[PDB]
Amino acid sequence: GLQNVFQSFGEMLVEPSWRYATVKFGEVTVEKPTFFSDDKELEFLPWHARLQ
């Protein structure tokens, strides 16, 4: 789903008025959920999110 969404948008030229800047999007990767604790990374569970 996300790959087709990010592969369908087309970025146009950026020119406020030679130099020009264009951006592009490549492969989209989604990592598993994690908890950013103060000490280190911990396993994240649905009930942890429900209680917190």
Partner 1 sequence: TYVCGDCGQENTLKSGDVIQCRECGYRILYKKRTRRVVQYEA
At a CB cut-off of 8 Å and minimum separation 6, what does 2 contact? 28, 30
30 is a site residue for partner 1 (CB under 8 A): no
Closest by Cα among 45, 11, 47 to 26: 11
Q: Which is nearer to partner 1, 14 or 42 (CB)?
A: 42
Contact indicator for 49, 42 with CB cutoff of 8 Å: no
Site for partner 1 (CB under 8 A): how many residues? 8
CB of 39 to partner 1, least distance (A): 5
Binding residues vs partner 1 (CB under 8 A):
37-40, 42, 48, 51-52
